[PDB]
Amino acid sequence: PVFHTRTIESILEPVAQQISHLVIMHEEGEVDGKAIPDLTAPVAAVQAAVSNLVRVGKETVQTTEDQILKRDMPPAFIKVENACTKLVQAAQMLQSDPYSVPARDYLIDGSRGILSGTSDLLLTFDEAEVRKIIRVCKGILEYLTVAEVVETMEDLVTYTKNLGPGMTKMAKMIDERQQELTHQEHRVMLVNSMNTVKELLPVLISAMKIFVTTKNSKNQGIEEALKNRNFTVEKMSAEINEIIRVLQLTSWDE
C-alpha cells in the first residue's frame, strides 16, 4: 500500500486512509442504524472530477508517441468510470433508503475502484517520466563514447563545452528524482552514484588534457593518459547504468 513517489502519496494516501476509516464502520453486508445524509451533490463533484481526469488522459493517448501509455492508460479510464457509476448508484439508493446496506457496499467498492484506477494512471505517468530521465542518462553514456576520438585541444574545448552543461542537467534531474522517491535505500544509491559521476568528470577532462598534449611525443606519458581516460569513461558508464537500473526498481510493497 506504499506509494512509489511523494507526489503520488500526497494525492492518494489521504483517500486510502479515509476508505480504511469507513471500512472500520462498515464491513461487507453490515447493518447500522445511522442514516447517511443525501450524497447526490458530493458524488456529482466526484463524477465531474472523474470525467475531467479521463478527458486529460484521453488527450495524452491521442497525441503521445509512447506505446506503453497508449496501452496502459485506457484500462485505467474504464476502472475509474465503472467505480464512479457505483458511487452514483450508491447516492441514488441512499436517497430513498438512508440505511441501505447494498449502498454502503457500493460506497466502499466505488471508492476503492476510484483509488485503484487513479493509482494505475499515476504509476503509468510516473513510469513515462522515468523513461524520459533514462533517455537523458543514455545521451550522456553515448557522448562519453565520443571521448576516445578527441585528439586535439580544439576538439577537447568543444567536447567539454557540450558535456559540462549536459552533465549539470543530468545531475539536476537525478537530484529531483531522488527527492521524490519514498524508498530511502533507492535515494542513497542514486545520490552516491550521481556523486561518483560528478567527481569523475574533472578527472576525465584532466586525463583528456594530458592525452591530447602528449599524443605525438616519444618520451610522452600518452599511455598512462589513454589508460586513465578509458578507465574514467568505464567507471562513469558503470555508475550511470547503475542509476538507470535503480531508477526502475520497485519494492515488495505491494
Binding site: 469507513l22 447517511i36 450524497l39 463533484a45 472530477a49 495524452t60 487513479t118 505517468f125
Partner: peptide, 27 residues
C-alpha cells in the same frame, strides 16, 4: 493540449473524494 495536466486532474479528483468521504463521516 496544455490547460490542465494529469497530476492537477488527479489532485482535483483526490479532493472531491476526500470531501465525499469526510461528508459520509460527519453523518
Amino acid at each position: 493540449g496544455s490547460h490542465m495536466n494529469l497530476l492537477n486532474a488527479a489532485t482535483a479528483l483526490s479532493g472531491s473524494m476526500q470531501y465525499l468521504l469526510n461528508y459520509v463521516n460527519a453523518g
